[PDB]
Design a protein around this ligand. Sequence first.
Ligand SMILES: CSc1ccccc1CC(=O)N1CCc2nc[nH]c(=O)c2C1
Ligand SMILES: [Zn+2]
Length: 140
Amino acid sequence: SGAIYVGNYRVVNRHLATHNDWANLVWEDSSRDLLVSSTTAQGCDTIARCDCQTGVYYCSSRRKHYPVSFSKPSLIFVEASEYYPARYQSHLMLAVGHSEPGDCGGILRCQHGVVGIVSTGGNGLVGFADVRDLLWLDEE
Ligand SMILES: CSc1ccccc1CC(=O)N1CCc2nc[nH]c(=O)c2C1
Ligand SMILES: [Zn+2]
């Protein structure tokens, strides 16, 4: 579990969104595993606006933050999980690292701010849903 809290937005994995998220929906995209809902309180996270390929992510199944090198956001085939069939997920970045299903939502960050959230795992890889192209998170 986990979310990004930027401005009056809450960014979560679409597959972990609650009824309150769907009832206060701003935007969702199944191909990216992302959903954004509106918040009453302002958040403290800042979004990175960059092409970094090194950063640090939080792994809840180890209570640890790990430094990683990660690929550029791409269209990647992901095997079937409890939430999606085997399919192509877009705007996904891969790194070598530990990730169990419940690790989804953990933040990946670089020197500029939040880069994305854990979305996929298995085979000793971790995948992150990028948010750096969502410029509108910084306004309204
Ligand atoms: C944090 S997500 C996670 C973590 C550990 C295990 C499973 C998940 C869900 C997930 O994304 N799967 C299902 C398992 C799987 N196995 C091999 N290759 C893959 O591409 C996948 C994709
Ligand atoms: Zn960066």
